[PDB]
Amino acid sequence: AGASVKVAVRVRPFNSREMSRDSKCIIQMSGSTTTIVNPKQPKETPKSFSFDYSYWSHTSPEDINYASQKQVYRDIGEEMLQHAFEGYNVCIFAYGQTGAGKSYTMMGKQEKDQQGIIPQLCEDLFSRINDTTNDNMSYSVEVSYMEIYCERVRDLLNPKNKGNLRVREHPLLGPYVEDLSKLAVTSYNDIQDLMDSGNKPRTVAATNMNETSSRSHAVFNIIFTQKRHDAETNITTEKVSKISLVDLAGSERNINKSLTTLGKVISALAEMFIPYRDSVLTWLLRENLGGNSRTAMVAALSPADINYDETLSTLRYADRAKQIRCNAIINEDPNNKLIRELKDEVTRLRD
Numbered sequence: 001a002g003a004s005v006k007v008a009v010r011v012r013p014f015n016s017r018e019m020s021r022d023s024k025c026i027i028q029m030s031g032s033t034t035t036i037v038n039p040k041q042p043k044e045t046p047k048s049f050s051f052d053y054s055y056w057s058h059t060s061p062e063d064i065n066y067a068s069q070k071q072v073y074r075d076i077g078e079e080m081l082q083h084a085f086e087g088y089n090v091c092i093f094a095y096g097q098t099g100a101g102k103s104y105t106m107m108g109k110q111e112k113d114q115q116g117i118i119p120q121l122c123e124d125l126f127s128r129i130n131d132t133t134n135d136n137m138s139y140s141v142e143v144s145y146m147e148i149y150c151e152r153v154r155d156l157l158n159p160k161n162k163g164n165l166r167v168r169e170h171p172l173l174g175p176y177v178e179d180l181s182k183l184a185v186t187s188y189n190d191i192q193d194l195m196d197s198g199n200k201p202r203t204v205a206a207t208n209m210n211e212t213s214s215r216s217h218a219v220f221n222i223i224f225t226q227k228r229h230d231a232e233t234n235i236t237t238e239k240v241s242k243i244s245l246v247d248l249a250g251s252e253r254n255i256n257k258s259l260t261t262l263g264k265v266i267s268a269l270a271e272m273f274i275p276y277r278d279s280v281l282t283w284l285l286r287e288n289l290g291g292n293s294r295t296a297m298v299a300a301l302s303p304a305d306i307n308y309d310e311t312l313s314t315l316r317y318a319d320r321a322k323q324i325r326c327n328a329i330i331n332e333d334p335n336n337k338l339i340r341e342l343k344d345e346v347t348r349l350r351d
């Protein structure tokens with residue numbers, strides 16, 4: 001019995017498509033509880049689901065029960081960031097139907113407080129670092145941003161590179177992306193400009209009217225290194241935590257082989273031969289799924305009757321995701337133990 005995957009769901013206002021079809025609301029929330037009415041058989045018992053958070057954002061932020069970008073960051077964003085500081089690897093991944101709110105949640109709009117989890121976590125990470133007053137604490141921050149489209153990886157921080165970059169198994173340390181930019185960053189503004197250009201490099205699709213393809217997964221990785229200098233011994237100990245921030249492809253379903261595999265993975269872990277390597281995504285995230293990571297899912301939900309089956313499917317995946325156990329441990333520099341002895345050895349040797 002370790003820790004389980006945190007699972008939040010979030011329902012947005014009607015979008016243009018839903019208003020055009022005079023869509024009604026079939027989603028209701030109450031504390032941590034989400035209820036969905038079948039608008040096709042309005043005579044069926046509604047189905048209810050209980051999560052770590054049921055966020056009601058169906059209205060406007062002028063309203064009091066509207067779950068804001070700040071609230072959702074502060075509930076799971078901060079929690080995972082604090083765990084990164086404790087020396088744990090963390091993952092949040094946005095799951096749901098095209099249009100349901102995944103990229104609003106993870107990225108936001110950046111116009112006014114519309115900033116999503118990723119930009120907030122980068123403001124908070126850098127904000128905490130520069131508030132440090134222990135001089136024996138110094139810090140390193142390395143970012144990777146990639147797209148998986150149709151099982152082929154691209155580098156969003158290095159667009160000129162057209163590499164279909166190869167997903168390799170390290171024979172000892174597990175999977176990595178060969179020759180993927182790892183860029184040292186020392187300012188929030190600096191990391192802003194990179195996930196800015198990163199986003200602009202995403203595969204665009206005439207099908208989404210030349211908006212970002214709904215079939216592309218966006219993985220934003222920070223390698224966070226904490227350096228503690230000891231004067232007495234002049235050893236520096238390092239904490240290394242990897243933060244994985246994920247904006248999945250559209251859940252509705254060769255080139256979806258990534259997303260269908262995620263399902264089968266989530267489902268295997270829930271009832272507990274795991275097909276981590278049947279797809280690039282489940283492979284690269286083998287560890288964040290049932291391994292050495294603290295992981296949260298934020299499922300986006302359409303409020304609209306027209307999306308009932310997709311929106312029901314998201315809820316049943318969310319609810320299965322709630323039964324996954326993570327075996328996360330603290331990044332432990334063996335040198336802390338070393339420092340404990342050799343310092344004590346010197347002081348008792350001054351009786």
Ligand SMILES: Nc1ncnc2c1ncn2[C@@H]1O[C@H](COP(=O)(O)OP(=O)(O)O)[C@@H](O)[C@H]1O
Binds near residue numbers: 012013015097105
């Ligand atoms: N909680 C929310 N508050 C306001 N607008 C939202 C919310 N969630 C989604 N939207 C809007 O819904 C639309 C869908 O974009 P998005 O949901 O990010 O796509 P996807 O779900 O495919 O990632 C956008 O216009 C976005 O601004």
Ligand SMILES: [Mg+2]
Binds near residue numbers: 102103104247
């Ligand atoms: Mg999106």
